[PDB]
Amino acid sequence: LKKYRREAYHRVFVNQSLAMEKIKCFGFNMDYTLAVYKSPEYESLGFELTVERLVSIGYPQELLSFAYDSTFPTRGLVFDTLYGNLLKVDAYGNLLVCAHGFNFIRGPETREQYPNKFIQRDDTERFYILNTLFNLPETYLLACLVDFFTNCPRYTSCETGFKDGDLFMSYRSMFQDVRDAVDWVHYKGSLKEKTVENLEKYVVKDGKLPLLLSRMKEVGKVFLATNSDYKYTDKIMTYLFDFPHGPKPGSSHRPWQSYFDLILVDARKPLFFGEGTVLRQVDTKTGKLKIGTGIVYSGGSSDTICDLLGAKGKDILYIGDHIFGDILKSKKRQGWRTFLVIPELAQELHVWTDKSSLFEELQSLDIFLAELYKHLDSSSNERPDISSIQRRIKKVTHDMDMCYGMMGSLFRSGSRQTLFASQVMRYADLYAASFINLLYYPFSYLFRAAHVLMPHESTVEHTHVDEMESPLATRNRPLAPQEITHCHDEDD
Amino acid sequence: LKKYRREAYHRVFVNQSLAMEKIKCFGFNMDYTLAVYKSPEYESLGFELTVERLVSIGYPQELLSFAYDSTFPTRGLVFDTLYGNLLKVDAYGNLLVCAHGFNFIRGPETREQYPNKFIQRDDTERFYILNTLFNLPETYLLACLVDFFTNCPRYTSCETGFKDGDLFMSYRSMFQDVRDAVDWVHYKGSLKEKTVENLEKYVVKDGKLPLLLSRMKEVGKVFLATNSDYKYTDKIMTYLFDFPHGPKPGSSHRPWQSYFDLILVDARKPLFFGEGTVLRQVDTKTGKLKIGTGIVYSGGSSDTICDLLGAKGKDILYIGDHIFGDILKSKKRQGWRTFLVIPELAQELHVWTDKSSLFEELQSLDIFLAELYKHLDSSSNERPDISSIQRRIKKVTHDMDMCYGMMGSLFRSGSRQTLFASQVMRYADLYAASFINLLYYPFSYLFRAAHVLMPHESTVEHTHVDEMESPLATRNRPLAPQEITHCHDEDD
Amino acid sequence: LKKYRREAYHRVFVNQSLAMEKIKCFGFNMDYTLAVYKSPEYESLGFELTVERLVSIGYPQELLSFAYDSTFPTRGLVFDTLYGNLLKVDAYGNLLVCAHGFNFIRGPETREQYPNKFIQRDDTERFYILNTLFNLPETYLLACLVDFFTNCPRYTSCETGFKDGDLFMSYRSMFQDVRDAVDWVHYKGSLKEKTVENLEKYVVKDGKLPLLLSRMKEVGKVFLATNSDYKYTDKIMTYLFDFPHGPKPGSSHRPWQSYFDLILVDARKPLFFGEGTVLRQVDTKTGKLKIGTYTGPLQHGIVYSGGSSDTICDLLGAKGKDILYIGDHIFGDILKSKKRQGWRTFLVIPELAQELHVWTDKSSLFEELQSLDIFLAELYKHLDSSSNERPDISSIQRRIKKVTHDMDMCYGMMGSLFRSGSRQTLFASQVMRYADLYAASFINLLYYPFSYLFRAAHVLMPHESTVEHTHVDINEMESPLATRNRTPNLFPLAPQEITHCHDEDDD
Amino acid sequence: LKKYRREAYHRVFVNQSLAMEKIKCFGFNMDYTLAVYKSPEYESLGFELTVERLVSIGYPQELLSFAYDSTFPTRGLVFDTLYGNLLKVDAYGNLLVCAHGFNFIRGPETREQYPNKFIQRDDTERFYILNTLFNLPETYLLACLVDFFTNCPRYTSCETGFKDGDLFMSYRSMFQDVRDAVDWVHYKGSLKEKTVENLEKYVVKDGKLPLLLSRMKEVGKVFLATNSDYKYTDKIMTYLFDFPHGPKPGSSHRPWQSYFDLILVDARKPLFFGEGTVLRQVDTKTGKLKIGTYTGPLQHGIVYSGGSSDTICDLLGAKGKDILYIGDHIFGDILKSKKRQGWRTFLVIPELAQELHVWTDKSSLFEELQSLDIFLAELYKHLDSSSNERPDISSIQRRIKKVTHDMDMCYGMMGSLFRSGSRQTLFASQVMRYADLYAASFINLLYYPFSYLFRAAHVLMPHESTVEHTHVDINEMESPLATRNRTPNLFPLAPQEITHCHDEDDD
């Protein structure tokens, strides 16, 4: 008998043990959490608006011919502003994939600009990390621009940018324009206007949302905390909750506000998690603000929301699509528990089960490769011929990569986890493709973390191994505590 | 048919793919690599000498009654100089185990001093990491001292140290004395004198060492680079190579120097990996030094050794017990490949296979626990009674911990890898309990990294899962590259 | 005799020597340099707009009762977001003046929050330095807010903020709203709109400006580099040059653009001094932009947008060395840290006009303080370590404090921009660090020939300023403790020519 | 009249006001404070020992040919480990003097390695600042080494070091050997041994020292705090106090220990100013130590080892405020950054003795420079921006450079410790930052009563030092560009008493 587990696509994955029974408040981001934007339509809209802003501000008319290609960008790429590269890197700064425009650079050539295939993430001035779902269009746009200027006759390619006559245009200054333009599209409400004038096209709607939030509110408190203003929030949330019946079968509809003990807009995250801004109440009928302490607030800070709800830190499960630094953990008061929404997980899981044959083959090749070396040790002069096998391993591995997209898996390249995966393991207690998967779990559930196995763990059997062990290895090899010395796996 | 693998205790574990065929130079640290100090005798010697230095310098006579307890210290603990705690932490700064003297502090009480069970490793002034094999005696000694002053009537326990009358003695200032004393024992040659006057007692000897080094020298170059001076190095290495026959059966003995293309002493690592010090030649018969370019050198730097050997960075496999920062990777020239000797691996592997029953039980408890929640989802009001099961999971888990020692595994506590494990995954291409395990591998071997699986990977089957998937999860879902975009898994 | 100097109010002051003959390009910021905003009318406008913004988003109506008070703020104060104090500090982080709202904290009381009367400037998270002229209304508003929440009984004062019932309202979060509101006023354009609709009220103009700029362009190139957009710049500049004559009276007026070789708008300083943004050239006839340089005839326009200081150098055919950059802002070590040559600097500090008036018109206060100081020395004369005398100086100290406070108030409630008592302010040390030349206005360059060698004055230490260049005869031998009893064969040869040249600027 | 001042060579100079009456505890460093080492004999000893050490571990025999040259090094030079230059820099990182070996790099050439003639001091990895008196022989040795490897044909000069055949030998790694060797000489005790075996040759002594210390102890407590061990301290101190009389001639000699309330050895400064090491009390009769304080009669000894400055404060029953710490070392913001009160400071700077002699005995050089400066001003008099004149100042500049170099060489090859031309050195700015009081020796305190109020002198900026306190009458109205045209109902009330007190030190 093997362990029971819910169906794969309904699962909530566990990084750190979490006893859901102790959770008293449920907190939601809105954007890409409750309001899931349809893909690739939303990225494309963001792409078009940014390109148009750039053109309206001096960039060549050629850009208007770019079309967003959803198959190219993977989230979490690092843009190197010195050399104009998109880089997929691991948790430690090692290069996995390097693309200059649409040209993927192989290993040997990479060492020219990166002699140890290494970058220092610390160099925030040089390296910009494109972690967010909103960063997707600009990730593609950056590649489009570098490709454009590289192959445009009017320009002269250099190491750190382009010559336009006697004039130099660095990748760095070009990056600033793109960054400024993306900011512009968002904060000018250009994007927001187009989204609300066509909700069906851009925003996913699902009857399960009101059901899950309903059930949460029966067991504890529910709050929203979004950077968006009330007006846009009201438009979006009305849409999400717009069904002829409430969530209980045969029940009548009710306002989205009804599902919340506390609604917070203009959150200004991430400053919100520090001292944020003064909390003010919102009169929804007039739109008049008033500092101090209806259930609609603007601004404030995470500590203030925690006070308003009568919650302590670890009583709160905060659900959202965004990875924040160690900011919460640094404070002297208890930080929140976290649930990270990662929509790509939906596609990634499909590859995991539907491309089963590719994994199979990779495993056979590995098994056969080990056979070739089976009889060899340090006294062996033999050099088995493996070039055919490797060649096939590379071909199958690349096919697998392409299953995810041109930039491969969000979580890995080959045997290496990405910086993004590493950040997920660091910040998220739980994760899933959507928060709606909580539907499939009781509120008393004990979320238990599975071990992440090191090589000597994953590849050594618990079977007792039947010559003496070298003393070079064994080194010639207080009242002890009578009760368990740690408690992180039970969450108590 | 499953994959062939060498016997567990002969294995070399792989973090990053490494084609041994391309390795042209083999580099060794001496201390705890070629010269493996017998345990716990060596730690005990270091312990006694440090305690005696402290007493000779004003600390109470009581200390002379301390005896080194090999079952207490695990390597890689963080000493918190503010509160006088030994901390086992994970890769991200989360507390796993907290010991004040010999008192292990449970969770609730920990939040008093660590409200989020979190420390900031960055705080190098506050937190000191005891990563080295030499740090073992002092790890125990620190616990001994805090325990001593806490339970000694002559003193008054405070949060950040002790009152001795109207006088305050902080943990921080006490830590400085211990650190100074350990330094003193090493650099005063006190420890070295006792070691060489009794090699059999303190230093492991193994005929396989000359064999492996012999074979390495047949295929490439071999060098030694040690911080020790030539005199101590000569004493130790003569001992290690002292057998009636050479390594080949029936062969005559030969000098240890014969096994090296290049011998470097007074290396002053880690400055050695930067610009180090001016390289000087050593006349072994006279002991006279001479800057500039026999095969014995003193000082110098890693770039200079690489030049002397005609090697490029990635041609070099550097074998040793020490984890260095990103120093090598930061340079503009190719860094070395790495093999990390981790002697504790010898004991850890024994636990893995000999305590099979404990793992079994833990797994059954997990399987049964999942049965209890099997029929429950968010509509369930049920709260299954699990306290008996958890209680048993804690008991079995603690028994497992104690198998490693009072401070548990070097690599983990529960479902969480330690900071030390994390550093191993970051720095070491390969690791083993000893470098001698290379004996069991041909020089043409392709070391291949195994994936470290995330939760959604390790707990989801490649079996195609047979209601529509929520659009909240799926989001209502350039010439592509025709060849593999990465190469780190083949090392080419 | 005595050294000839120009009239005090026409002087350019010299921190580091500058041979004007080598300057080939003159660069100008616009705001508070060419366009000098009327005071206190312009500060008061910024204040009211910022106040109104805060009220419009929830701050109490009582804020509307506050009137801008130009006598209160001095530039360069540090706002401590932890304790809600405005601090006047010296170059080394020592506290000189501490105001909590409009309450000045003196001596011993300061030690409760600042145990060594010291802050660590590096803590940019905690301390915000209000260095700019635009920061003036902000400086006053912070004080108004701390003061109001303190006096208003609706709010309960704590060390790090106020409680409004169950809600804590930290000084840090209140500061954030003030910063947001100041930005909003500036970047939504309310301030610019009010400005251009009454330029006579808000903007100074002087016929000497076209004159000086025309002379500059006879010996070199002249450029404008401003963060403002072209529309605003054009409105401002047209006004500055709007006289019924050109550079000289009786000459034809000409358009302001005719005075420049290059006009750079939307500069995005300080990013501008790094890699900035892609340079575009602007067609003002059309309003369209194009990145790079126009290929056709439009290339003969001179209006550009974005770019970087390196790019501007290239366009002008200049090396940094031969550019004098004239403006009101102090930048960091950004320029000199580069591999590229940095610009010479002239810092405009308009408060100098008022400060020099105090220095010169309040001479009797300076004279009394000197007399009192001389009298104190007299009281201790002929006393040494064997002496038991404790002369009573309490009356003299009381007068010193009284006259010194009177002097302070001549500058304003926060004292001089440049000092408090014997101590220079942080702002003053930043001036000495960043500016080669400084004056109340760049217009003082009118009074110097372009061949002028500006020579830096020595800044004297205590042992230099209080000891004469006169042979001091000693009766007894000097202590070997002081002298150190001071009076192989290889010795280096001494240098035969001067080893430094920073004072001649003569490369 | 004119202000009374003590004789220049007896003066204590004041950076920040200090009411001596409030000082209740006097603390002393030993090295270069109480034990002033003979110059240049002691520098030369350190030099030779360090040279010998380097030779003994592989450096060429030719190093033995170098003789210490006291006329070369000035304290506070920055060694650039990248390019192998000794740099004299100002407070802001600007280059004043650059020496590569014994070759001085001038003007334009400096720009090749320093494009803006600027270094970033923060780059502690690259730049090592040689601030201490012990660093003097080291400063000279670095120059000797760069010079020797440059001239010796066995080695080929590169930008960042030398090639010895196939071996590269970077300036950074060579610097590391020099640092290691200096430490070794100090910490193996070779230097201490040579010192104590000839104290008359290496250590100054003055009967005024016991005198001054005895007076201090009549008004307050006196303590010693030294990094040295008791054995060395005892040998040094016994020598310093070895006269056939006590404090006053004709009085009985007494042991040096009798002059102190507390003797702290093995202080491990600067860690000492943090948490240091556990305090132990030393029994000098026995030589044994015990952490904490002796419980029995031994508690009446006064020799301690290790500890921290906070602990020492506690032992003395003093608050930081009332301790004056006298020594030759400049510490960082360590003390004032603490929640605990920091110590007042008297900085001993023995070079001041020679510097003051130049200031006073070379008056004719100062007079010529003033004349030349006045003549330059005359040549530009009555010229303004309309003027085409380019007066020829080349002859005057040449003389200025010549006289200025002559002045420099009066101090040494690297010029004054405190300045180069019109610019203060980094060292000078650190003095102003760290020291309340300074002098060539603490012995000058002999010439002041313990009731003395030390009053800081203003450090004048250019617009203060070159403008008189005299009413300046203006014919034409001042430009609104300079004045800003400067001349709700709620206004704050002005402060009625002085808002700062750092100049009276009167809490």
From Swiss-Prot, chains A, B:
**Modification sites for Phosphoserine:** 388, 470
Extract the Pfam families matched here.
Answer: 5_nucleotid
Q: Which organism is it from?
A: Homo sapiens (Human)
Q: Where does GMP bind?
A: 29, 31, 179, 183, 192, 226-227, 269
Instruction: Name its cellular compartments.
Output: Cytoplasm, Cytosol
Report residues binding P(1),P(4)-bis(5'-adenosyl) tetraphosphate. 131, 332, 423, 427
Q: Which residues form the active site?
A: 29, 31
Under what name is this protein listed?
Cytosolic purine 5'-nucleotidase
| Recorded coiled-coil stretches | none
Provide the binding site for adenosine 2: 406
Q: Which residues bind adenosine 1?
A: 131, 423
InterPro entries given in the database record: HAD-like_sf (IPR036412), HAD-SF_hydro_IG_5-nucl (IPR008380), HAD_sf (IPR023214), Pur_nucleotidase (IPR016695)
Q: Name one GO cellular component term.
A: cytosol
What's noted on cofactor binding?
Binds 1 Mg(2+) ion per subunit.
Give residues annotated as binding IMP: 29, 31, 179, 183, 192, 226-228, 269
Linked pathology? Spastic paraplegia 45, autosomal recessive: A form of spastic paraplegia, a neurodegenerative disorder characterized by a slow, gradual, progressive weakness and spasticity of the lower limbs. Rate of progression and the severity of symptoms are quite variable. Initial symptoms may include difficulty with balance, weakness and stiffness in the legs, muscle spasms, and dragging the toes when walking. In some forms of the disorder, bladder symptoms (such as incontinence) may appear, or the weakness and stiffness may spread to other parts of the body.
- Disordered: where is this region? 478-492
- Positions that bind (2R)-2,3-bisphosphoglycerate: 121, 332, 427
What are the UniProt keywords, alphabetically? Allosteric enzyme, ATP-binding, Cytoplasm, Disease variant, Hereditary spastic paraplegia, Hydrolase, Magnesium, Metal-binding, Neurodegeneration, Nucleotide metabolism, Nucleotide-binding, Phosphoprotein, Transferase
Q: What is its EC number?
A: 3.1.3.5, 3.1.3.99, 2.7.1.77
UniProt similarity note: Belongs to the 5'(3')-deoxyribonucleotidase family.
Q: What does this protein do?
A: Broad specificity cytosolic 5'-nucleotidase that catalyzes the dephosphorylation of 6-hydroxypurine nucleoside 5'-monophosphates. In addition, possesses a phosphotransferase activity by which it can transfer a phosphate from a donor nucleoside monophosphate to an acceptor nucleoside, preferably inosine, deoxyinosine and guanosine. Has the highest activities for IMP and GMP followed by dIMP, dGMP and XMP. Could also catalyze the transfer of phosphates from pyrimidine monophosphates but with lower efficiency.
Q: Which Gene Ontology biological process is one annotated for this entry?
A: dGMP metabolic process
Query: What modulates its activity?
Result: Allosterically activated by various compounds including ATP, 2,3-BPG/2,3-Bisphosphoglyceric acid and Ap4A/P1,P4-bis(5'-adenosyl) tetraphosphate. Binding of an allosteric activator is a prerequisiste to magnesium and substrate binding. Inhibited by inorganic phosphate.
Q: Which reaction does it catalyse?
A: a ribonucleoside 5'-phosphate + H2O = a ribonucleoside + phosphate; a 2'-deoxyribonucleoside + a ribonucleoside 5'-phosphate = a ribonucleoside + a 2'-deoxyribonucleoside 5'-phosphate; IMP + H2O = inosine + phosphate; GMP + H2O = guanosine + phosphate
Enumerate the residues binding dATP.
Answer: 121, 131, 423, 426
